[PDB]
């Protein structure tokens, strides 16, 4: 299907401790492939997926410079924002940036994104037309006007529609054996009595990729979107994901409940029953 | 090691244009933001413009916006300042300077060149007449003799004097120019040398008044 | 327009901690840089980001910045530190780098040093061009103030004189020049000319003759 490439950046100011913490991660779909961390020992952008190691020294030099340049921009911006907002020097503040692009199943550009937050709240974002900005507040309006005057949207668009796409497509080819493949959920049901009259049924999905999945409980073939305990999808730690859903049922009525699992790794949706 | 060598300075009639260039060496030029900063005669420093490492961001002082353009050629390790519609108040020493990071914003200037002079003037250039200042008897009791060159009647400043094509540096004192009532300048440059070594080593001042393309070499003999 | 204010002059004794201030509205929220510019030299970065020192800069150069005031501190100040110091900040609201107006740091009490005077007669070449200039070169004096008197056979000459206001040399001492313009005839009609330099009540005389 479609694919995305996303870069996530977090800068945290650290008064007295000296320099800000800077961490950048890059993803293709739900697979991390690089990282840059100011507190890591390396000082370079480094690989987090085997297929990005196909890239040569020039790629690594270039992407390392980009990470060092971005780091310095956010460090400047942390000082700048403290100034715009008239904040004191003693507290710690955070900038987050996410950017990237989506392509279709045949590599066609679908869209691009660029959004910035300060202290966990929207600051400025490139709109979908990639030709204009939305500023969340009056400080971001200072940023918006100066960015409009220098035609910053054109520069971002050139990136999002150009190298972002070129990069993503190349990663999809080089890493096709993992990125363009799926891992289906491994499933099972557990049963745990609560009392003499009720029992918990928990339907598990393990070892799946990508992260997107739908777990649904039915009773006599009817959706049970009320008495359902449902956890956030979570990383297994090996590049795959886990999720469960549970229902409290009357003891003896277990066979009436079915768990339905939908995942692109499955040729057909799965139905589980105790 | 690291050098930032400015050139292109000279006398320009107001309303005309001039291009300054700065040759960078001894560092990875494309890893750093670069800037032009100027200093008018007797005054403080004024930032003129900046350019980030990959030209991704560029800035200008309000005093120069619409008239000056900063650019860089990362293949040639060069930075440029195109100055158009020049005004009397643009007269200054222009310094090429390295930004201490990738970006022209926020990060200060950690390496500065020696500067190049821009004189925006309605007047004409005049190259100087150079005369030798011969060494004479008991010129300094401590076995040293003084000899120099008189650089006479030029406009505008500056003029550079070297000796033996830059080989001889120790003992050289080029004096600040006098501004004569005529409106023209004169300066002298003296080299004090051991009195034993006369008629052994040749002494030549190399005068360069770049504003008028005037280059004069003058042998200075004990004649 | 964002403004940084420096006192135009700070005077100090060797061995004290000199302090140069840089005032600015909420300058504490900005990242201060300080530059040192000695006579005849390009500026040098001595402190960046309020308090850091580039490699090579002595530990005795330090900085602070909070509220409406940044300070450059130079401990164990020595004569070599005499210079113009400029504070600076990037101002994002105005998209400008701003510099303070500069502080001239004088180190008082340097040793009195009488001037060395060199007087040159006119060159053959110059006379050959029907002109004549006597050149009086005055160096290594401290402090920087002198009286220059020209005489023709002991008779004071005022016309055709051009003397520079003294300027601080590389070594913290001063230099000055005086030039006497004459016709070849005037030059030859005298047994000698002299350049008399008075400094702190003491006079050095030099003489030249056709």
């Amino acid at each position: 299907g479609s694919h995305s490439m996303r870069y996530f950046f977090t800068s945290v100011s650290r008064p007295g401790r000296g320099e800000p913490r800077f961490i950048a991660v890059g993803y293709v779909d739900d697979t991390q492939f690089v990282r840059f961390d100011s507190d890591a020992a390396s000082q370079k952008m480094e690989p987090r997926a085997p297929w990005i190691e196909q890239e040569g020294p020039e790629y690594w030099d270039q992407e390392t410079r980009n990470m060092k340049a971005h780091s310095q921009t956010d460090r400047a911006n942390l000082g700048t924002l403290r100034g715009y907002y008239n904040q004191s020097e003693d507290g710690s503040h955070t900038i987050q940036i996410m950017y990237g692009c989506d392509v279709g199943p045949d590599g066609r550009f679908l869209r691009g994104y660029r959004q910035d937050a300060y202290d966990g709240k929207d600051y400025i974002a490139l709109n979908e037309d990639l030709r204009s900005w939305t500023a969340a507040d009056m400080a971001a309006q200072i940023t918006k006007r100066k960015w409009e005057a220098v035609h910053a949207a054109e520069q971002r668009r050139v990136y999002l529609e150009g190298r972002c796409v070129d990069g993503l497509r190349r990663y999809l080819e080089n890493g096709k054996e993992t990125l363009q493949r799926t891992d289906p959920p491994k499933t099972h049901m557990t049963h745990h009595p609560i009392s003499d009259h009720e029992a918990t049924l928990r339907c598990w999905a393990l070892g799946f990729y990508p992260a997107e999945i739908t777990l649904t409980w039915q009773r006599d073939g009817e959706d049970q979107t009320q008495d359902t305990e449902l956890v956030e999808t979570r990383p297994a730690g090996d590049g795959t994901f886990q999720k469960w859903a549970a229902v409290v049922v009357p003891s003896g009525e277990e066979q009436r409940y079915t768990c339905h699992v939908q995942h692109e790794g499955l040729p057909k949706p799965l139905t589980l029953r105790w | 090691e690291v050098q930032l060598v400015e050139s292109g300075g000279g006398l320009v009639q107001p309303g005309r244009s001039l291009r300054l260039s700065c040759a960078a060496s001894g560092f990875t030029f494309d890893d750093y933001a670069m800037h032009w900063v100027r200093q008018a005669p007797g005054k403080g420093l004024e930032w003129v413009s900046g350019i980030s490492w990959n030209s991704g961001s560029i800035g200008y002082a309000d005093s120069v916006k619409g008239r000056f353009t900063i650019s860089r050629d990362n293949a040639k390790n060069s930075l440029y300042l195109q100055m158009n519609s020049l005004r009397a108040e643009d007269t200054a020493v222009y310094y090429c300077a390295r930004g201490r990071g990738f970006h022209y914003y926020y990060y200060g200037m950690d390496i500065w060149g020696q500067g190049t002079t821009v004189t925006v003037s309605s007047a004409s250039t005049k190259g100087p007449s150079v005369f030798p200042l011969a060494p004479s008897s008991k010129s300094t009791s401590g076995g040293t003799a003084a000899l120099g060159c008189l650089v006479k009647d030029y406009f505008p400043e500056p003029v550079t004097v070297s000796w033996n094509s830059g080989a001889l540096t120790s003992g050289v004192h080029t004096f600040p120019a006098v501004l004569q009532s005529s409106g023209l300048y004169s300066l002298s440059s003296v080299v004090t040398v051991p009195s034993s070594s006369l008629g052994t080593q040749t002494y030549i001042c190399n005068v360069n008044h770049k504003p008028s393309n005037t280059k004069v070499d003058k042998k200075v003999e004990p004649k | 327009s964002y403004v940084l204010t420096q006192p135009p002059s700070v005077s100090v004794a060797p061995g004290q901690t000199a302090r140069i201030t840089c005032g600015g509205n909420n300058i504490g929220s900005r990242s201060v840089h300080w530059y040192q510019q000695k006579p005849g030299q390009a500026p040098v970065l001595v402190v960046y980001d309020d308090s850091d020192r580039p490699s090579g800069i002595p530990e005795r150069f330090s900085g602070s910045n909070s509220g409406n005031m940044a300070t450059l501190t130079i401990s164990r100040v020595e004569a070599g530190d005499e210079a113009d110091y400029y504070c600076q900040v990037w101002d994002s609201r105005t998209d400008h780098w701003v510099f303070g107006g500069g502080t001239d740091l004088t180190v008082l009490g340097q040793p009195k040093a009488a001037p060395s005077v060199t007087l040159f007669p006119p060159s053959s070449e110059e006379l050959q061009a029907n002109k004549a200039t006597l050149v009086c070169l005055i160096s290594d004096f401290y402090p920087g103030a002198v009286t220059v008197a020209w005489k023709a056979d002991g008779s004071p000459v005022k016309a055709g004189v051009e003397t520079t206001k003294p300027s601080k040399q590389s070594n913290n001492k001063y230099a000055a020049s005086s030039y006497l313009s004459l016709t070849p005839e005037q030059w030859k009609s005298h047994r000698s000319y002299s350049c008399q330099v008075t400094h702190e009540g003491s006079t050095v005389e030099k003489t030249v003759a056709p």
Partner: peptide, 9 residues
């Protein structure tokens, strides 16, 4: 590949 353009706020 990341975006090489840096802009101040």
């Amino acid at each position: 590949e990341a975006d090489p353009t840096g802009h101040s706020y």
